[PDB]
Enzyme design. Structure first.
Site, PDB file in Angstrom:
ATOM      1  N   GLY A   1       0.743  -1.312   0.046  1.00  0.00           N
ATOM      2  CA  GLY A   1       0.149  -0.102  -0.098  1.00  0.00           C
ATOM      3  C   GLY A   1       0.779   1.346   0.141  1.00  0.00           C
ATOM      4  O   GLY A   1       0.114   2.267   0.302  1.00  0.00           O
ATOM      5  N   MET A   2       2.091   1.303  -0.108  1.00  0.00           N
ATOM      6  CA  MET A   2       2.600   2.679  -0.171  1.00  0.00           C
ATOM      7  C   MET A   2       3.104   3.140  -1.476  1.00  0.00           C
ATOM      8  O   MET A   2       3.460   4.433  -1.479  1.00  0.00           O
ATOM      9  CB  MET A   2       4.326   2.269   0.430  1.00  0.00           C
ATOM     10  CG  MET A   2       4.417   1.764   1.944  1.00  0.00           C
ATOM     11  SD  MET A   2       6.058   1.628   2.539  1.00  0.00           S
ATOM     12  CE  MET A   2       6.478   0.482   1.296  1.00  0.00           C
ATOM     13  N   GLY A   3       3.004   2.502  -2.643  1.00  0.00           N
ATOM     14  CA  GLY A   3       3.178   2.709  -3.946  1.00  0.00           C
ATOM     15  C   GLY A   3       4.348   2.208  -4.771  1.00  0.00           C
ATOM     16  O   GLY A   3       4.854   2.508  -5.750  1.00  0.00           O
TER      17      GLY A   3
ATOM     18  N   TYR B   1      -6.356 -13.805   4.249  1.00  0.00           N
ATOM     19  CA  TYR B   1      -7.031 -12.838   4.860  1.00  0.00           C
ATOM     20  C   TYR B   1      -8.254 -13.603   5.442  1.00  0.00           C
ATOM     21  O   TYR B   1      -8.746 -13.035   6.616  1.00  0.00           O
ATOM     22  CB  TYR B   1      -7.601 -11.865   3.793  1.00  0.00           C
ATOM     23  CG  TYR B   1      -6.122 -10.720   3.454  1.00  0.00           C
ATOM     24  CD1 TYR B   1      -6.153  -9.734   4.375  1.00  0.00           C
ATOM     25  CD2 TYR B   1      -5.403 -11.271   2.528  1.00  0.00           C
ATOM     26  CE1 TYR B   1      -5.081  -8.979   4.469  1.00  0.00           C
ATOM     27  CE2 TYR B   1      -4.223 -10.110   2.454  1.00  0.00           C
ATOM     28  CZ  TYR B   1      -4.131  -9.114   3.380  1.00  0.00           C
ATOM     29  OH  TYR B   1      -2.838  -8.321   3.642  1.00  0.00           O
TER      30      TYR B   1
ATOM     31  N   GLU C   1       5.266  -8.815  -9.059  1.00  0.00           N
ATOM     32  CA  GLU C   1       4.753  -9.531  -8.006  1.00  0.00           C
ATOM     33  C   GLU C   1       3.888 -10.882  -8.864  1.00  0.00           C
ATOM     34  O   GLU C   1       3.480 -10.455  -9.822  1.00  0.00           O
ATOM     35  CB  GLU C   1       3.674  -8.811  -7.521  1.00  0.00           C
ATOM     36  CG  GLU C   1       2.669  -9.346  -6.543  1.00  0.00           C
ATOM     37  CD  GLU C   1       1.628  -8.174  -6.345  1.00  0.00           C
ATOM     38  OE1 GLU C   1       1.973  -7.203  -5.291  1.00  0.00           O
ATOM     39  OE2 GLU C   1       0.443  -7.941  -6.703  1.00  0.00           O
TER      40      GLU C   1
END
Ligand code: TMC
Ligand code: TMC
Lengths: 316, 308
Positions: free
Chosen positions: A14-16, A56, A38
């Protein structure tokens, strides 16, 4: 003597990271820089079915008391093996082509990876241990399996305030703030650990300074206290003998953790900026990275082939 | 620098490997024993029992194949931890080949491939591990260092069943289907090392598994197990991610030196044969002056902590 530059972009989700890696690659000539993405297709279909959905789903059912910690650990452990397989097999096939560490002329080839094998064999497992869904013994077994650190291993970690990080994440996985905190903490701990080792830190000498609880710069700054390193996570009752020090089997695994991380080249990328801003910042950082020679005449083309193959088969 | 002789006693369980290794060393020969205390207590609680109960539950239809594979996978990580951590720390001490008696002889009860390849492959044959998980463990096999001498056994099946019944570990269930599977995997393993040593190229011979230097046929090697449909694309081709894992397997196995010990005899007869096998094993130099005493320390500490 062609040289290679390997750079692994890693850190919390989630940081870019993915955007900025693509942006950096888009700047280069298609033939002298290749992106190893990825392996999402391996994770959702090839290795098992919807591995991310299962991780999850498992943490949620554990959190809701629908399954036990033991049930959670077995699924999380097997899931992490699946998550790490493309990274481990890529590292193993790349290994023979890497010669010694070669500022220096521009590399013949630059490979930018979306993550290193320690994300799946060390970081995510350590965060799941903090989340209650992995045992510390399983995290150490993964550590003992981390492959020897090849020369020229440059790892770029990311910095991003929690509030901006949380902001980006309200995008759609499942929204787990505890997991976000855990993975940020673990990557924090990892940057401090590399600096601690590079400053001559000996965990065996400082183990006794840990007794306490929980209260980063990977290539600058003074030496961190062992309490701010990854070695702090393994003071768990499960790993301690009746005399109080770690069983030797776990101590050896920590010896392995030290060996693997000490020789790595770690850099911190500020992600608190626009996508083009991250791209430049990473490009400026790429100038202080260590390149290696390759071992054979045809290693460049072979490596390039491997990377394109990987991207085609396993990236979305 | 002094020389070292590493000897890994491996192969199917139930053959008498531990009996015969006991006798072998019963200060220039140290034994790294079976890490039973890690398996039963340190790593997890009674992992042997968990493995055999899971297969039993699967065989009876109480749990799904998917549920079994997750357990077997997680449990094989536990089983192999002692071997993997031992190899990781011993690795920097091993130098190149040396080719008179060694300064130290280190005898181990199994090599990392038992937990990262052979047991996983047998469980795949038992329907309790996915082939993708077996190749994940294969990708994690440590690089084969010089002097990796591995002793595998030979024993007729009926005799092996008899010995298996006496050698039952804590939590083990007598399973003749698993005995057949582990015997098949180890036989395939020995043939695979020969195949690779005589220049066999799995990529070149792969069509023989589907389109119909003397060496075993590829169908008589471990590569045949990886023709599993889960690893193939719709057109039948193996995904490259798995092909790469097979390339890793070929690399790791080719340079191992395999010796076969006949177990169809007494414990003193087995112990004596083992000792006869040592003349053909490859010794290495150690890398530091202090490598010997520290390896000896590793071995005694392992034994004391994890040995039964
Ligand atoms: C590498 C890694 C990632 N992940 C998840 C979190 C992350 O947001 C992600 C994309 O990186 C979906 C996949 C894990 O759970 N384990 C791991 O080893
Ligand atoms: C090495 C290994 C052994 N085992 C079992 C079989 C064997 O008889 C034993 C002792 O050697 C009980 C333990 C597995 O299940 N997996 C493995 O990787």
């Amino acid at each position: 003597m062609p040289t290679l530059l390997r750079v692994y972009i890693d850190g919390p989700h989630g940081m870019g990271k993915t955007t900025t890696t693509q942006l950096l690659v888009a700047l280069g000539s298609r033939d002298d820089i290749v992106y190893v993405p990825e392996p999402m297709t391996y994770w959702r279909v090839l290795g098992a079915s919807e591995t991310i959905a299962n991780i999850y789903t498992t943490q949620h059912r554990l959190d809701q008391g629908e399954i036990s910690a033991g049930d959670a650990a077995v699924v999380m452990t097997s899931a992490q093996i699946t998550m790490g397989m493309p990274y481990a097999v890529t590292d193993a096939v790349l290994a023979p082509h890497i010669g010694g560490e070669a500022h220096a002329p521009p590399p013949a080839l630059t490979l930018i990876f979306d993550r290193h094998p320690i994300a799946a064999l060390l970081c995510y497992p350590a965060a799941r241990y903090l989340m209650g869904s992995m045992t510390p013994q399983a995290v150490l077994a993964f550590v003992a399996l981390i492959p020897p650190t090849l020369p020229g291993t440059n790892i770029v970690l990311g910095a991003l305030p929690e509030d901006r990080h949380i902001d980006r994440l309200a995008k759609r996985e499942r929204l787990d703030l505890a997991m976000l905190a855990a993975i940020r903490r673990v990557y924090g701990l990892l940057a401090n650990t590399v600096r601690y080792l590079q400053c001559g830190g000996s965990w065996r000498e400082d183990w006794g300074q840990l007794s306490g609880t929980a209260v980063p710069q990977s290539n600058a700054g003074p030496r961190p206290h062992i309490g701010d390193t990854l070695f702090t996570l393994f003071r768990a009752p499960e790993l301690l003998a009746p005399n109080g020090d770690l069983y030797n089997v776990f101590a050896w695994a920590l010896d392995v953790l030290a060996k693997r991380l000490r020789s790595m080249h770690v850099f911190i990328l500020d992600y608190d900026q626009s996508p083009a801003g991250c791209r430049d910042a990473l490009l400026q950082l790429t100038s202080g990275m260590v390149q290696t020679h390759v071992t054979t005449p045809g290693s460049i083309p072979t490596i390039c082939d491997l990377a394109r193959t990987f991207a085609r088969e396993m990236g979305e």
